[PDB]
């Protein structure tokens, strides 16, 4: 797997409860099936002296989400997005498009309902067998 090389940028996912629907940013540290990653945004300590490292499943990893027609495109009610929240990307569904150009996003998993600015949203992508979508 080309992207899984030590030093490579990856988005990390969890099967763990409370982390349903999130991609956090990170890099590979070692590959042996499980491998070791270092989060970019999470730390062991509240003081940020020690980047969080974990052993996860390759199933759980993926390349950095693909990157100007893409970002200028409008967001619609019903579009699947990731919202940047708690320092990672969480998938929810756009429930409302607001007058000031903000958006209300429903998170099916946590029953949360949160408003965001466009700069806080990216289009949701899926990574399937080496391909995006």
């Amino acid at each position: 797997p080309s992207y899984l090389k030590p030093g490579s940028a990856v988005e990390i996912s969890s099967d763990e409860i409370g982390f349903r629907g999130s991609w956090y940013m990170g890099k590979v540290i070692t590959i042996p099936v499980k491998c070791q990653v270092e989060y970019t945004t999470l730390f062991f300590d509240k003081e940020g002296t020690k980047p969080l490292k974990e052993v996860v499943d390759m199933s759980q990893l993926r390349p950095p989400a693909p990157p100007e027609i893409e970002k200028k495109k409008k967001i619609v009610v019903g579009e699947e997005v990731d919202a940047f929240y708690n320092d990672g990307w969480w998938e929810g569904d756009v429930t409302e498009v607001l007058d000031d150009g903000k958006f209300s996003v429903f998170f099916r998993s946590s029953k949360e309902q949160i408003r965001f600015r466009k700069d806080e949203l990216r289009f949701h992508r899926e990574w399937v067998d080496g391909a995006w979508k």
Binding site: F43, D45, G48, N86, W90, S110
Partner: peptide, 10 residues
């Protein structure tokens, strides 16, 4: 300064 404890939703 985000931690797993203050990042988890559950």
């Amino acid at each position: 300064a985000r931690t797993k404890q203050t990042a988890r939703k559950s």
